[PDB]
Write an enzyme that holds these catalytic residues in place. Structure first.
Site, short mmCIF file in Angstrom:
data_model
loop_
_atom_site.label_atom_id
_atom_site.label_comp_id
_atom_site.label_asym_id
_atom_site.label_seq_id
_atom_site.Cartn_x
_atom_site.Cartn_y
_atom_site.Cartn_z
N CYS A 123 -40.96 -36.62 1.41
CA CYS A 123 -40.10 -37.67 0.85
C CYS A 123 -38.61 -37.49 1.20
CB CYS A 123 -40.43 -37.82 -0.63
SG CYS A 123 -39.61 -39.29 -1.25
N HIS A 243 -45.81 -38.20 -0.74
CA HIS A 243 -46.02 -36.90 -1.35
C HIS A 243 -47.47 -36.43 -1.18
CE1 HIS A 243 -42.23 -36.13 -3.63
NE2 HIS A 243 -42.07 -37.46 -3.56
N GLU A 245 -48.94 -33.53 -1.57
CA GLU A 245 -49.33 -32.60 -2.63
C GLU A 245 -50.01 -33.29 -3.82
OE1 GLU A 245 -46.31 -33.80 -2.05
OE2 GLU A 245 -44.83 -33.36 -3.60
#
Lengths: 280, 280
Positions: A123, A243, A245
């Protein structure tokens, strides 16, 4: 499929006990003291590190302690921050909150562009990978995030409120067969990922960045939005506007983080070729 | 004068035993493994460190291990080299022999230009302070030592065989009352120093460097030759074309090296003001 999930759990667990060698990663961002504020990022590095059979050692760097101003203000912590950046086998800019850390995160991205250190920007990390490549490869030393609104002409980004959120697709640009990241995704035509962004890289500049080698290997459905970049002919320098993750799983690690660990281990080729899948 | 020399010896000796705190200096050059090849430089740092009452810790860096190429070739030693550069309270480029180390010595000079680390460049170190300030402040990314002869147009230096050797004078430029280095010389009108150089900075460029702030605070009798530089408004960033370590003495430390230690100790003002002379 129940017994297979247990066998695959015993495998990733065995790969932690049977872990011979460390990978050191500098995670560089705002307020890294608040370690729960990066929890998903840590878990995404753990899931991937068990695929690589390698022990994970996250160095926590406050991004502001890298700054040239920190050297007179708080010299001791500035040396600790730079030793971590200089030691690490990979750099990670984790998608921080607000503007404060930006100036140090630029110098961490520069450190991994020039010297061939593996890198992932998430990001704000793609934003800073693009601000740095602008600020050092194109010259353009005045360029900054759209957050510095009244500079106008030198804003590196544009507003896109639609905030963009939730699972949206991303499509690889059809020529980019060389890409390290689109190899990790198994040569599949598209990916689906979580987002949380109000800014994107200004489309007006993207031809200049693509022509200079900061190739945007993935874009949205319209082709207007900057979703992934890879720097052409670097061992591993990726960023994602999403993102990743938020979709890492213990048996299926999120591919942008698997590449960061595997290239930090110097094993990226063999992970792509399949020397580390859990069952034959 | 015999009894006074003994008293002053007991003082500099006492200042070694009574030494409470360390100063860490990275000495960055070719083949630093060959530690006798820098012997005078070490002794010049020792003489000055006893004036500052501070314990000297020279980090030995091979300049070539800083290079972006060393990261794939010999990664382990490259991290050791960069940890030393990142740790040090001062940087020193020592007047190396031949071209090999140059590319890393540029990045060590950049590290101390940008982040306000104290610096001294000796001979090839002034050459590299000027190549770096050219290569990063003026743009001009192709610029190099006159050693890369067939590039012609981008040579940062010019031949001056007269080799220039032995004790020659150097005269301060008459406006430079702000200078940290000409304060350490006691406001005296000129200095006398040893030389060993076949190249000097190309006079054609020196107005551009002076106008951008790399002020050449000392020149020769003719005013054609670049003998000292100081970067305007930095805590301590000096270089000398001469080798000042060939006139450092245990009771009278060579001034360019005294400034490097004193600024690494963060005490430079008080050394100039006289808080560290041996007898009242």
């Amino acid at each position: 499929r129940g017994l297979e999930l247990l066998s695959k759990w015993k495998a990733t667990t065995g790969n932690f006990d049977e872990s011979m060698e460390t990978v050191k990663i500098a995670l560089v961002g705002k307020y890294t003291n608040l370690k729960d504020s990066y929890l998903s990022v840590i878990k995404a590095l753990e899931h991937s590190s068990m695929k690589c059979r390698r022990k994970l050692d996250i160095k926590w760097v406050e991004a502001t302690d890298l700054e040239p101003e920190a050297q007179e203000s708080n010299k001791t912590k500035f040396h600790e921050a730079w030793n971590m950046v200089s030691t690490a086998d990979g750099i990670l800019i984790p998608g921080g909150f607000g503007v404060r850390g930006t100036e140090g995160m630029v110098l961490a991205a520069r450190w991994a562009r020039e010297n061939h250190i593996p890198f992932l920007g998430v990001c704000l990390g793609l934003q800073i990978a693009t601000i740095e490549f602008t600020r050092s490869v194109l010259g353009r030393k005045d360029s900054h995030s759209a957050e510095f609104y009244p500079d106008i002409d030198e804003k590196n980004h544009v507003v896109v409120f639609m905030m963009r959120l939730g699972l949206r697709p991303t499509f690889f640009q059809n020529e980019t067969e060389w890409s390290q990241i689109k190899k990790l995704y198994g040569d599949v035509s598209e990916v689906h990922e979580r987002h949380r962004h109000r800014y994107e890289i200004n489309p007006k500049m993207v031809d200049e960045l693509e022509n200079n080698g900061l190739i945007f290997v993935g874009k949205d459905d319209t082709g207007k939005r900057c979703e992934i970049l890879e720097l052409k002919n670097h061992p591993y320098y990726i960023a994602t506007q999403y993102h990743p993750e938020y979709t890492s799983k213990v048996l299926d690690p999120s591919k942008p983080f698997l590449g960061l660990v595997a290239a930090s281990a110097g094993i990226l080729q063999d992970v792509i070729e399949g020397k580390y899948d859990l069952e034959a």
